[PDB]
Amino acid sequence: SLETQAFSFAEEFAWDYFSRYPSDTQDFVRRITKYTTEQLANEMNNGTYSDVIYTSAFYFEKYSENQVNVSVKARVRVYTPKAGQEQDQLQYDTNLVDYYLEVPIVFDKDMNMAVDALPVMTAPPEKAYFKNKEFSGTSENDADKTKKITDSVSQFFKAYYEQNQTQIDYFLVDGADIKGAGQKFSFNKIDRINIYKLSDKEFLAIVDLNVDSFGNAIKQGFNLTVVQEGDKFLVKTLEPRTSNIDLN
Amino acid sequence: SSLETQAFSFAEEFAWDYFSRYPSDTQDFVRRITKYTTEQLANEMNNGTYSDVIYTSAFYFEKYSENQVNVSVKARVRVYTPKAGQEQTPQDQLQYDTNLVDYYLEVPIVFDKDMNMAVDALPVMTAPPEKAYFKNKEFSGTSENDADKTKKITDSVSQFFKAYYEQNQTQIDYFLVDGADIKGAGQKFSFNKIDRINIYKLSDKEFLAIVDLNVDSFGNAIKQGFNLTVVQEGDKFLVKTLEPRTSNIDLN
Amino acid sequence: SLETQAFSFAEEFAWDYFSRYPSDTQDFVRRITKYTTEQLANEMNNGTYSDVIYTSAFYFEKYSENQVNVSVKARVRVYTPKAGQEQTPQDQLQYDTNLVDYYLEVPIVFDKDMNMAVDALPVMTAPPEKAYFKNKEFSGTSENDADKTKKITDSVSQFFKAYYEQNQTQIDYFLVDGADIKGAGQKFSFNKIDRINIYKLSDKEFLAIVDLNVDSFGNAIKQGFNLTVVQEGDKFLVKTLEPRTSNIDLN
Numbered sequence: 001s002l003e004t005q006a007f008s009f010a011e012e013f014a015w016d017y018f019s020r021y022p023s024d025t026q027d028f029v030r031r032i033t034k035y036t037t038e039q040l041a042n043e044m045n046n047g048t049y050s051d052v053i054y055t056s057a058f059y060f061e062k063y064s065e066n067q068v069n070v071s072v073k074a075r076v077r078v079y080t081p082k083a084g085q086e087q088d089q090l091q092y093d094t095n096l097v098d099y100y101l102e103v104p105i106v107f108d109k110d111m112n113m114a115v116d117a118l119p120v121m122t123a124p125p126e127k128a129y130f131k132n133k134e135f136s137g138t139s140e141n142d143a144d145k146t147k148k149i150t151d152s153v154s155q156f157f158k159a160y161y162e163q164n165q166t167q168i169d170y171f172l173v174d175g176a177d178i179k180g181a182g183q184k185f186s187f188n189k190i191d192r193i194n195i196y197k198l199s200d201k202e203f204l205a206i207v208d209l210n211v212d213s214f215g216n217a218i219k220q221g222f223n224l225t226v227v228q229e230g231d232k233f234l235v236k237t238l239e240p241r242t243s244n245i246d247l248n
Numbered sequence: 249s250s251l252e253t254q255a256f257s258f259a260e261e262f263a264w265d266y267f268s269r270y271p272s273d274t275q276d277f278v279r280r281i282t283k284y285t286t287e288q289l290a291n292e293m294n295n296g297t298y299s300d301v302i303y304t305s306a307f308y309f310e311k312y313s314e315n316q317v318n319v320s321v322k323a324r325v326r327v328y329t330p331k332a333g334q335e336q337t338p339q340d341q342l343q344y345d346t347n348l349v350d351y352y353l354e355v356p357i358v359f360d361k362d363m364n365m366a367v368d369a370l371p372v373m374t375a376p377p378e379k380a381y382f383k384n385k386e387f388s389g390t391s392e393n394d395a396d397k398t399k400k401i402t403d404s405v406s407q408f409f410k411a412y413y414e415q416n417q418t419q420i421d422y423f424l425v426d427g428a429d430i431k432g433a434g435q436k437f438s439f440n441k442i443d444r445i446n447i448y449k450l451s452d453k454e455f456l457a458i459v460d461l462n463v464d465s466f467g468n469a470i471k472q473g474f475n476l477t478v479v480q481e482g483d484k485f486l487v488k489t490l491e492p493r494t495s496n497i498d499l500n
Numbered sequence: 501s502l503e504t505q506a507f508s509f510a511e512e513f514a515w516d517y518f519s520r521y522p523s524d525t526q527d528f529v530r531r532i533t534k535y536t537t538e539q540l541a542n543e544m545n546n547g548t549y550s551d552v553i554y555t556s557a558f559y560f561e562k563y564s565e566n567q568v569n570v571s572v573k574a575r576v577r578v579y580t581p582k583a584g585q586e587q588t589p590q591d592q593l594q595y596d597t598n599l600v601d602y603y604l605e606v607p608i609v610f611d612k613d614m615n616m617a618v619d620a621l622p623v624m625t626a627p628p629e630k631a632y633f634k635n636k637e638f639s640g641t642s643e644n645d646a647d648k649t650k651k652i653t654d655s656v657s658q659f660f661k662a663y664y665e666q667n668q669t670q671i672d673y674f675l676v677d678g679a680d681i682k683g684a685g686q687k688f689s690f691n692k693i694d695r696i697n698i699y700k701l702s703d704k705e706f707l708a709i710v711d712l713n714v715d716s717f718g719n720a721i722k723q724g725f726n727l728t729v730v731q732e733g734d735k736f737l738v739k740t741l742e743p744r745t746s747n748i749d750l751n
Contacts, residue, residue: 001503001560003253008507008556009628012573015554035630048719054264055554058257060250063742064749073261078717095717100685104743106633114631117744118724121664121714123682125258127284128366130358161373177613179375182352211373214327214347216297221370239312240356241369246313249501256504303515307508309501322512377509379535380615413624431626434603463624466578466598468548473621491563492607493620498564 002068002107007057009035009113010070010103014055017101017119018076020048022087036115043118049079049092058125067106071122074099100124133244135223137196140203149195149226152233153205156224160238161187161211173227173236185211185218198247201228206242251317251363256306258284258365259319259355263304266371267325267351269297271339285367292370298328298344307377316358320374323351352376384495387475389448392455401478402445404485405457408476412490413437413463425479425488437463443471450499453480458494502568502610507557509535509616510570510606514555517622518576518602520548523590536618543621549579549595558628567609571625574602603627638726638748640699643706649698652729655736656708657693659727663741664690664714676730676739689715694722701750704731709745 016031025045032041053075061069076099079092102122107113140146156171160180168180192208203226210217223245225237239245265280274294281290301323308320328344330337354374359365392398408423412432420432444460457476462469473494478485491497516531525545532541552574559571579595581588605625610616643649659674663683671683695711706729713720726748728740742748 001249001253001501003250004501004503004507004560005558007253007257008558008573012554012556012558015575043722046719046721048717048721056257056261058254058261060254063744064751067744067747067749069743075264080717097687097717102743106631106747108631112629112631114633116633116747118722120723120725120743121684121688121716121721124685126362126364126682128358128360128364130360130366130368179378181373182376185373213373214297214329214349216295218295218297218373219292219370220372222372240318240354240372241312241316244316244358244368246316248313249504252501252504256508305508305512307505307512309504324515377512377534378615380609380611380617382609382617382619431629433624434627437624465624466548466580466600468546470546470548470624471543471621472623474623492569492605492623493563493567496567496609496619498567500564 002062002111003060005111006060006068006070006105006107006113009105010057010072011055013103013115013119014057014072014074014101015052017044018050018052018055018074018099020046020050022047022049035113040115040118050076052076053096063104066108067104067116070103070105072101072103073125074101098124130244135194135196135204135206135243135245137198137204140195140197145203146195149203149205149233150190150193153193153207153224153226153235154190156235157190157207157209158187161185171235173229173234176234176236178235178238185213187211188217191219198225202226202236203228203233204245204247206245208242251311251359252309254363255309255317255319255357255359255365258357259306259321260304262355262367262371263321263323263353264301266293266353267299267301267304267323269295269299271296271298284365289367289370299325301325312356315360316356316368319355319357321353321355322376323353325349325351350376382496386495387446387448387456387458387497389450389456392447392449398445398447400483401447401455401457401485402442404478405445405459405476405487406442408487409442409459409461410439413439423487425486428486428488430487430490437465439463440469450477454478454488455480455485456497456499458497460494502562502614503560505614506560506568506570506608506610506616509608510557510572511555513606513618514572514574514604514622515552517544517604518550518552518555518574520546520550522547522549540618540621550576552576563607566611567607567619570606570608572604572606573628574604576600576602601627633747636747638697638699638707638709638746640701640707643698643700651734652698652706652708652736653693653696656696656710656727656729656738659738660693660710660712661690664688674738676732676737679737679739681738681741687716691715691720701728705739706730706736707748707750709748711745 013035028045029041055074057070057072059071076097078095078097082091100122101119103119104117106116159168188210190209194206196204205224207222210219221242223239226233227236262284278290304323306319306321310318327347327349331343352374353371355371356369358368411420440462442461446458448456455478460473462471476490477488513535528545529541555574557570557572561569578598582594603625604622606622607620609619662671691713693712697709699707708727710725713722724745729736730739
């Protein structure tokens with residue numbers, strides 16, 4: 001996959017692009033020449049002092065039959081000289097910066113890659129908007145069933161968070177592939193539960209709950225399809241989301 | 249593919265901020281997380297945890313609807329817990345232990361027509377990767393056991409590996425079948441020796457060598473295992489293929 | 501996607517494979533057993549002291565119906581004892597730091613449920629190799645009219661000042677209606693255009709090829725773009741914005 005490999009290449013390149021040492025600007029040239037020509041490495045260099053927290057490729061554009069542009073988010077520390085020092089003895093302030101760098105990449109017939117031009121500062125990602133949609137369905141109205149389903153779901157979550165797969169599987173429909181959270185959390189309680197009847201024997205439980213990790217509570221939200229079988233209510237599915245639900 | 253690739257990076261970026269928490273200024277988390285989600289969800293996700301991040305790695309993709317996906321992310325994190333005996337100590341005076349923790353976070357993502365993304369619900373703790381089963385199956389073939397020929401193949405393979413680890417491509421090429429595309433390891437290791445070699449005859453003048461060997465990097469030995477197809481040219485054996493694995497081999 | 505998943509798995513594994521603490525060798529076995537058998541985890545262990553900066557999968561090979569090989573670049577620190585310490589107790593050792601990029605080929609097995617494991621010793625492999633390219637200057641016809649080149653230049657300069665410094669409402673004034681061109685987030689100071697060559701593509705449509713520089717935290721950084729610019733009345737509006745100042749493809 002071209003995009004997959006281009007993303008890793010752009011991330012690697014970006015790591016070096018934002019790693020800069022005025023204590024030796026040729027170090028940048030040595031490192032960057034692994035990705036591009038000497039001429040381009042020199043053009044890209046400057047007097048910045050910076051190092052890297054992460055690089056993450058976020059957007060892909062096919063530009064021609066052998067060229068792509070990959071936009072990369074880099075979290076970086078940029079060190080600026082402290083005030084009143086108007087080189088080897090400079091004291092610095094640390095600036096935490098997120099950069100968005102568009103990386104032009106050429107590839108050959110063997111999928112070897114090079115950065116083929118100056119990278120440029122580009123637009124950050126833009127958040128999607130969504131209108132919340134509460135579940136549209138018929139609330140389960142029988143109090144006996146509601147309590148039974150609720151206790152089953154509660155016991156299931158205790159096992160999901162705290163117990164092994166063997167113990168968990170007793171709560172599940174046959175072949176429901178729901179693996180536990182690795183016995184790494186203490187289940188506190190269900191904070192909110194709403195139950196809907198889907199069909200004669202199937203129900204949706206929409207659940208807000210919290211668990212502890214290392215002494216602090218973490219909120220969680222799920223929906224679960226639950227199946228009535230005999231005296232039992234067994235878990236068929238486990239999904240995140242408590243609204244904007246799609247059961248298809 | 250493109251949706252999954254971009255969703256992976258988005259979930260990893262989100263997870264980095266999700267697991268960076270500073271209880272002295274919880275608004276910092278809200279500021280950062282609001283880049284990905286609503287200010288309401290940002291506040292719902294916040295807590296009193298103190299943690300920072302080593303890595304985030306998206307490992308599983310689920311398509312949920314026409315415009316929603318779920319991406320599971322492994323985050324290696326440091327969680328700071330107050331040292332024992334500070335139940336009565338003011339928060340700003342606390343001393344901390346460091347806990348190294350791997351978390352597995354399922355991130356629900358919505359996208360619009362332009363493939364802009366947002367986290368559309370609380371992320372939840374999910375199952376870790378489960379190891380696949382495997383069991384070694386030794387290569388099934390005809391062993392080559394002639395003393396001198398075994399000596400000759402072992403010497404050719406030993407010479408090839410010294411080149412593969414230590415020498416330039418020009419030097420490596422002398423040991424290869426014409427046009428075999430086998431590039432060396434970048435001259436960054438000292439080849440020590442072959443520790444084990446088992447040889448099988450594949451056809452006239454073609455053999456499989458299954459090799460355990462070790463090399464040095466910065467004064468410590470690292471074990472390596474390969475299988476190589478070699479072609480007999482007189483006393484010399486030229487390398488046709490080089491692959492990892494010394495069992496569960498597939499020559500097709 | 502198998503490749504996408506195998507890439508992530510290989511990266512995670514390589515992170516542990518290059519994290520080694522000789523005062524606690526069992527720690528490596530514990531961590532590596534998350535990916536492979538305890539026997540193979542031990543076979544992979546040694547007395548190295550090392551930790552990890554990044555891991556990045558770069559190459560994928562399908563090996564069989566249940567096996568792949570993923571090559572991973574790992575940037576690592578390897579700590580080597582300073583001189584004179586051959587007989588010094590482990591816990592008193594002083595170290596030098598070696599910055600190293602490793603290229604690790606990771607053999608992975610996958611099952612019908614796409615669970616994965618490392619099924620063999622990983623091996624040191626070949627680093628990536630750069631693509632070579634011959635630079636091609638843009639092939640079109642220069643626009644030479646003084647008035648028109650001045651107007652285009654001034655419009656492009658104003659556009660870039662907004663692109664780097666201003667909000668989208670301001671940038672939109674310089675764009676063809678509908679152009680999908682978002683600004684750089686107001687985080688740079690636009691300095692000047694350093695080089696501009698203008699070409700006529702058709703009636704009232706031009707390509708500007710531009711070298712410029714901007715400031716971030718007190719230092720200048722060079723940028724290169726090509727932009728399609730269209731005449732509307734007496735104005736010139738920006739229609740496209742792409743990196744590259746040569747090897748250009750307008751299709």
